[PDB]
Every structure is written in structure tokens, then in C-alpha cells.
Amino acid sequence: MELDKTKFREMYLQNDSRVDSYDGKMEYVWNGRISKDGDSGGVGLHTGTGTKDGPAVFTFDLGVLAKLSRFALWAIQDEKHFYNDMSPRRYEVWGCATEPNPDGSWDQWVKLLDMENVKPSGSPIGILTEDDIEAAKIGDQANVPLDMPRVRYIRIKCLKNWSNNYNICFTELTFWG
Amino acid sequence: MELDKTKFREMYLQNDSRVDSYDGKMEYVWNGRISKDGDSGGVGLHTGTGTKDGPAVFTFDLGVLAKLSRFALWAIQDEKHFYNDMSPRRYEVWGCATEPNPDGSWDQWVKLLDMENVKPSGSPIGILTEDDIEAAKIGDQANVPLDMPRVRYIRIKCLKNWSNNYNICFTELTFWG
Ligand SMILES: [Ca+2]
Ligand SMILES: [Ca+2]
């Protein structure tokens, strides 16, 4: 099944990135809307454009203990953001089963997924083919390996975005399990 | 019993006030620390000083369904904030038992408590007695009536703060039940 996004909850551990730049909010990435700039109802989350010391990190609660099967993520749905801007290019999804320590340490977390947003055409930043746009509307898609433990809490870490920095912005994610 | 603050979670319903001014964050009002400006570890939440159209409102999840018995709230613990600044003066606590509608409507919520932060000395703003200080370390304190329903979700509405507007800032709250 698709996990029930009405149960998802923002968390904030020490050293996590704020995600509320450009009127963003973490709850906007589980509002069931895959949005673009100018849409109503909260477009997505956004850490900003300022330098960071390392990869952006944020944390949330699925509200259920689940055996995960699949994961998807969508960039904000316009040319400004497709394979561009602060959209994520290399990123990770991590999980754990018991309450996250508020100090934000990685110790208890397990890495579920190594994600790469691949641009089908491989065109330079700012050029898009019809296949690049199609892929962006499908979203990044992954199956979670069967050996992963059941998890309830999630972290996303942005290793690099499409502008070669550590910020991240996007519109929606979905979990199944 | 004191409700387990490790389980509390921020929510964000449409039209809720952002509470992240001055490096604030909602989770700082259930971190177990009753803090003043300059302290480490997140001082409190703060909606800013912009003029609002109405009472500031924000929402959170207790993480359990509880029969509530008591509520307490502390202002940021220094003379700048005691009966001053954006510290709450008249405010309300509201609750419900089932998932909050994300449209932020009041329809499903029930008002649990009418709170007033009373300044013992009644002195003008900026003047503090020893009694006024002692009361502010003890915090606002209320018993929740036995005829209230069990609730899992909470809203706080700031009708008026000590600067005669709708903003709110404070360092910690506690629920028992
Ligand atoms: Ca969304
Ligand atoms: Ca606190």
C-alpha cells in the first residue's frame, strides 16, 4: 500500500537544515500535490541557496512502523527546477525504528537508498528534451531492498543538487510498504 | 503522569502562524528546558513582530490519546520577556481526538482552557517585583476540567500578548494526564 501521508509528521533534530525558504514547509512534500512555482496550497520545501558546511539533512516520522517497498520523489514541476536550481541530484534516504535521538547523530540510522536523479538526455543544465520532462513528471523511483529493517522515522540527506551545492528543494515524496 | 514529550510532533495546518522567528522552532517548547535568551539548545518559539489579521494559532500532536489533567506554560525566562515582549497574556488551549483537517478550520476542535497570565503586582510594563518574578519561574498552571474529552492534537491561540498584539513567544509547555 501507499503509506497514509495524513499520519506523516515533521521532526527537527539538532543540526538539521531548515526547509522553510521561499515560503516552503516540510508538510508540503506529503500533501499529495505534485506542484510547480505559482501553484496554491504550498509548493514544496526549500533549504535556500546559502552555503552550507555539508549536505542538507532533514527528518520526519512516517507515523507507522512499516516494511518499506518503494520510494518516489518529484522535483518542483517547471523548467526552473527540472535538473536545475536546488533540485536534488545525489541524495540518500535513511531510516530507523525507534525514537530518533534529538542530538541528530547518525548512529542509530540505517541507509535505505542511494538515489541519483539521472537526466535521460544528459544535456547541459538548462536544456531539456521531451524524455527529460517525461522522466521528471514520473519522479525518481526506487524499490527498497527486502533485507532492510522495518522503519518508522526517515532522514533525507542531499549530497549534491543540480547547482553543485548542498541545498535541496522539491515538491512531493511518496512511500509504499 | 507527565506526557512523554519525546512523542510530541509539530503540525502545520493552513493559515497557522509560523513560529520560527529569532531562530525559534516549535520543538523547542517541548525540549524539557525552561530557557532564557542566550541559552544553548533552542530557546523557544516565536511568531515575530509583524502585524497579524487575528490571534496567532499553531498546532501540534501529543503522540498519544490522553485524558488531560494539567497544563503549564513558561515565558522566556528573562526580564525582557516577563509580562513583556510577545509573551502571551490571554490565550487558549484547544484539542481534538482525530486527525486534524489540513484546512485549519476550527470546526472539529474543542476549547480545553481559557488562560490568562496574571502579573501579581499589577505594575506597569517594564516594572517587576519579586512576586512577579517568582510567578514567572513557576509558569502559568491550570487543571483541565474532568468533563473535557480525551485529546491527541492541540492548538494554542494567542488572543493578546503583553505588547497588546496577536504574536506569541515562549520557552516551554507541559501536559499531564
Ligand atoms: Ca507536495
Ligand atoms: Ca523549551
Author numbering:
A (entry chain BBB), B (entry chain AAA): 220 to 396
Cite, word for word, the article reporting this structure.
Herein we have identified eight Sus-like systems in B. thetaiotaomicron that share the feature of a homologous SusE-like factor encoded immediately downstream from the transporter/lipoprotein duo susC/D. Two SusE-like proteins from these systems, BT2857 and BT3158, were characterized by X-ray crystallography and BT2857 was further analyzed by small-angle X-ray scattering. The SusE-like proteins were found to be composed of a conserved three domain architecture: a partially disordered N-terminal domain that is predicted to be proximal to the membrane and structurally homologous to an FN3-like bundle, a middle β-sandwich domain, and a C-terminal domain homologous to family 32 carbohydrate-binding modules, that bind to galactose. However, functional analyses with BT2857 and BT3158 revealed that the SusE-like proteins exhibited galactosidase activity with para-nitrophenyl-β-D-galactopyranoside and α-(1,4)-lactose substrates, that has not been demonstrated for SusE proteins. Using a series of domain truncations of BT2857, the predominant β-D-galactosidase activity is suggested to be localized to the C-terminal DUF5126 domain that would be most distal from the outer membrane.
The BT2857C construct crystallized in the P21 space group with two molecules in the asymmetric unit, and high-quality diffraction data was processed to 1.42 Å resolution. The structure of BT2857C adopts a β-sandwich fold with extensive loop regions and high similarity to the equivalent domain of BT3158. Structures of the DUF5000 or Ec domains (BT2857C and BT3158E223–P440) were compared via the MatchMaker in Chimera using the Smith-Waterman algorithm, yielding a RMSD of 1.225 Å across C-alpha atoms, and a quality score of 0.768. There is also high structural similarity of CBM32 with BT2857 (2.015 Å RMSD), including a calcium binding site wherein the calcium is coordinated by the side chains of N250, E391, main chain carbonyl oxygens of Y247, R252, T390, and a water (BT2857 numbering). Intriguingly, crystallographic ethylene glycol (EDO) that was supplemented during crystallization and used as a cryoprotectant was found in an equivalent location in BT2857 and BT3158. However, there is a lack of residue conservation at this site with the exception of a conserved histidine, H265 (BT2857 and BT3158). Notably, while not sequence conserved, the single Ramachandran outlier in BT2857 is D304. D304 is structurally oriented close to a channel occupied by D256, H265, and Y241. In this channel there are three conserved crystallographic ethylene glycol molecules that are present in both molecules in the asymmetric unit and could suggest the position of carbohydrates for modeling purposes. This region is equivalent to the position for carbohydrate accommodation by CBM family 32.
